[model samples]
Target: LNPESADLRALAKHLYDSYIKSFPLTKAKARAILTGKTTDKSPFVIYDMNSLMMGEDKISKEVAIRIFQGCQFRSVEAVQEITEYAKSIPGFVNLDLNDQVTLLKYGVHEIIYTMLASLMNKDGVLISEGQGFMTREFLKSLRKPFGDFMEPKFEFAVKFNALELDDSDLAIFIAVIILSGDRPGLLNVKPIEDIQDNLLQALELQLKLNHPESSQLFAKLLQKMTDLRQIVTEHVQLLQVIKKTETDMSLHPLLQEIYKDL
Candidate 1:
């Protein structure tokens, strides 16, 4: 393989294999918690990095309180993982620093929810399963417009999972979300856009090979971005609803920070 003619597929495939489905909570953990095979969610530690490494390990007063904080902590961890994953992409490091931060700032949730699709079984997202599994039926029982993902995310997650993307496909999509052009203050937008376009082509290449008869898969995948934005938007709205309706409800400070951007 000479430098004159690059093995783009091999590079893309390498990226896919390396970082694609390898989220913080790997599939092994997902399956464990989902089946009630693992249930030691003691939860009292007000800390990160090896729960048992510190904090006496007590528990939360209300399960919802812990779940709120848990979402904050996990989202932060997911963003850190996402930043490293973006760095692994071919030219991501070469982009302007501010642009890199800007993309990560705005784009993390899209990648988060996109990956959340994998954790979905008929049971719902596995992240909620730790202390107690949050089922669609239970959350949806919140009722009205703000029920189940507060509304839209559940729909998108189900559709996304229906695509049955292997790790390779997910890897490319995550990259696309990170390199999104619409992020505010994205000064070095064109180069990031260029990288995203290249990955989109790679994604299309994968689609062709993986689902040869499926003509509209690429289109549908792109459309999911719109779906993702709406889902994330509704997520912010859900928090606002909580602030308004449940007067005593308290949001994790980090969650408040996340919503502040919106």
Candidate 2:
């Protein structure tokens, strides 16, 4: 973002555009894809079961496994997307491999959900050129106990959506997500934090310059990070519970490792 250097701006814009264009529309297309919507190929699942655990379903256990795997697929799809984005950014590459993985490990869910705010058009979160590939209804339809994994994300989206950011603001905010410094295992936080601070400064400047009439806009968006922290804490508890109850199938080894250390 140096005023004197043109390519610095180009590089930043390129990183942002690449990430936006590359996000997957479907869980099936995600790198962490599961075999089917369900394990034993059930015709359907109960969408709106109001229990914390989804309690029961008419589907077979195998189909249920597929659903389970697919939910994880949905999450890892975001993880993989964020991973690729990090890989694409030369700045991220310069941060060292361990820091790269660690940042992604801790920050993937936050980034995924933040981007989800952009994708949201009220209840319909578009997955593809379809009715409900990854919509709110579809996420609810995947009601195999761990369904609550999605609610806070949608909640975050609704609030972030209210802020109504265009691509540039979002792009910069995404950079902040990638460069998060708060994760436990950072080898050196300053480099990553420096990137985040730069993005923060850029966002503040742009918002002030571009949206002069709006009051406290930057402050509100940053507050969502506090909200994000709460959602993350709740999800961690839920994930820990999910880890305990998931008896049949295996979680991804990397996820297991991350959560184990977490």
Candidate 3:
């Protein structure tokens, strides 16, 4: 049989199911939580911090400390989910541990931002495990460095969300991001590229199947990958600012590793 005769649709479905199994929260449940219509308490109590902070003008020093620390904790949790999802990819776990670590180290931020689109809208992102909807304007008003940190991500997420991708679509998109061979310090680029190439085929097929009416949606998703790189670049720069001013606030060790050597 020709290479072209492989059943791409079947491959895509397997990959899609792999992502669904690894994802802790279903998109339906996440939306239910986001819209404040859910009765389920299994995930934890949801707080509307936006309303809670209505009268608050700026983040006080103490409040800022908590915000930074809480976000760090959340990042740590999200990283575990991303790592689990990465392992579910067919060839990814078989890669050398160092290469696995390297891809995850470089790609975690992109995956986080992409996944965050599910918890966000055009205005702001959900923080503290969806306990609060932090407004973009409020986050932008924070003191220097910290203030600049979120806007680019917000902008990227807003535009990325407009694509209206479901979790299955995002699942493959994230897999492609992780398996990317372009990241610096990759040891085994060929194997990584092979995985990424297969994921790209699945992603394109799934996006077409997922959004049949949108003729160019796959191209838009590819463009967003470039955009993700730019956002991460700026994020690393702001991280340096945080390093200088917020010596007392601690970023989790694993989270710090993502920005390491950047």
Candidate 4:
């Protein structure tokens, strides 16, 4: 059931409405296609040039270009016109070197993703294929900075390297299990007590590694485990309260959903 106080859903809908409003042609075409008023033969293209210039902080001219370009279809001439216009604009030619590099990187990635999504949506037959391609590209992009951070390798290393079962690691692992809804062939491999004991041993090993270092990584791990244990304990208590107020039937659907993907 939907939550009674679903402010996030409301906010999401509002934002989506605003997005549709910003691209009138695409919206109208989509509606026409849906209602059988127009055939879905032509593509619905929208470009956002400004997406590159707007980072986590400041907005830039590139962002404005994206917003304008994305709102409507442009011919080759139109693209040339925008390029010429950019060249004539003051301060356009005077962007900081760092800002220029940042804009290039951000702009290319944004435009590529936007174009792929638009094209994929336009041609229904290739939608799943496009999605697979995009996912592969995205994974490749992460190889430079985050290849080693993949879940399987990272988790394996964590389990292999830890010296002791600090409270923090235990807490994090437990939280991970809870959030992931207990994946089969993983958390179910061993009993909860055995997992806890293993984590404690790992934590001790980590402490030994941190012994010679000035930074207190071990202390942080301990804190994390303590925090996780507290959270899990509280959750268990809350579950008891829910059980007293509700019948086992209340949990059946949720449990079924949780295990469905497995």
Candidate 5:
């Protein structure tokens, strides 16, 4: 019954169809893509519609929508616009996928904030699955820099991290930290003692909102979380040492200088 098998693609297409049917505008867009009538002429366009399509194998519909909303790029040109801006940044020239995700998350938050702040006439609301993938505090952290340059970056960070196992693992690490609710030094937030409860609530919302295919993907993710927890618990001391080393190395002068001055 693992949806990651052949049935996953079918499930995804069905869900996508359902979603498109529910949203007239989205349905129109899909039709345009199908009919080769879309006016979008940007180089970063998603050429392979099938590839962009999500299934139980990788991303859920909810995740995809969050990413799309975060990027705010409805056309191919929009992708190029963002990529160019990202490349122009001092330290972002050769950013790896992890760094790129961090940048995109920050950049998208900035855009969303600006839209909400400036567009008083618009009554649209952005929604995201409460899986700790995106959060209010995390978005707030990116406001200052995004204000300086309202540039569009390609949503490359999405496909890469969304598909790569290592990137997924890192994402899990972040989720674990958020779920712990301890507000580590890196996070400036009120301590939440009911972190586990909040995490379960978030998980429930994510699962409930997702399409069936996506739901299956999350089911697997839940299993992975359990496995990861067991593994970490079994090697708690070693994990602590590794974490300390990583923290120290990340804060080392040379690393800081490379990012801060370059």
Candidate 6:
């Protein structure tokens, strides 16, 4: 075997291990959602138990604010976890601090969207590791823009889940997302590109070995990356609208920090 083959193999393994370590949900349980056998009961429960228990149908302003805050809290935690996962990728910590933060800032939402497949199926998503469940209809009930935030994600997740990607596939996928050099304001572009290229190679190698029957899977994954950029772009646009129009719904500082530039 060529020396580079071993390197790619090791890189893929490292990414898979790091992903398994960082993400909270298990692969089996996540796949269970695809099979319609998830043990997480009550598919309609929202993330906040209190909100679901109250069972208010037509969402009030107060309920909408509460739900938005709840989502922000979870997003902060998810961003932190994505940051940690990025650190586990080789050479990530060696990058300049600004470059590191820039990667997280631009790429965090993409990873979150990709990972959302684990918690979601065709109908709804499970939050906090299945501690709560929220149907698509329920989220749509929460006023204008706030309610609109998740529909795109659910659309993406439903198709993404069809790929049947396991934790290992997702590990390499997310690593590539964070290491992308295309994000604006990257000072160390060449280094980031080098890292990203190796990751892409690793991803291709791993996918070929794991899904040999799916000849176009790698191309499909690349297309998904492009799709993710659009999803995130729309997300930023919606956030801008919310910032201008929804004065009462305060965003968390963590999200505010990420959203500042993008």
Best by lDDT: 6
All models: lDDT?
Answer: 0.67, 0.64, 0.75, 0.31, 0.31, 0.81
Give the 10-residue window scoring lowest on summed lDDT in candidate 3.
40-49
Clashing pairs in 5: 42-77, 82-152, 82-153, 83-153, 83-154
How much is 140 displaced in model 2, in angstroms? 5.2
lDDT of 2 by residue, 1-262 (tens): 4673344455456755776676644322221121234322312223343321332322126444565576576666667677776776557888878988888877777776776665554454543222222446656655456667677778887787788676667666667777889888899998888877766766676667566888999998788888777787787787777666776567786566556565
Question: Which window of ten consecutive residues has the lowest lDDT sum in model 6?
Answer: 40-49
- Report the C-alpha displacement of residue 186, candidate 2, in angstroms: 1.7
Report the Cα lDDT for residue 100, model 4. Answer: 30
| TM-scores, all models, native as reference | 0.76, 0.73, 0.85, 0.20, 0.23, 0.88
Which candidate has the highest TM-score of all?
6
RMSD of each: 6.5, 7.8, 4.3, 26.9, 19.8, 3.5
Model 6, position 20: C-alpha lDDT score:
75
Which window of ten consecutive residues has the lowest lDDT sum in model 1? 40-49
Candidate 4, residue 110: lDDT: 19
Q: Cα deviation in Å at residue 243, candidate 6?
A: 2.4
lDDT of 4 by residue, 188-228 (tens): 32343343344344434434543545356555544443333
What TM-score should be assigned to candidate 2? 0.73
lDDT of 5 by residue, 195-249 (tens): 3344344343434444334535445544443433333233333323434643432
Kindly indicate the candidate among 1 and 6 with the higher lDDT.
6
Q: What is the lDDT of residue 1 in candidate 2?
A: 42
Instruction: Tell me how candidate 4 scores on lDDT.
Output: 0.31
Which should have the higher TM-score, number 5 or number 6? 6
Off by over 4 Å in 2: 1-12, 24-65, 121-124, 128-144
* Candidate 6: Cα lDDT at 31: 60
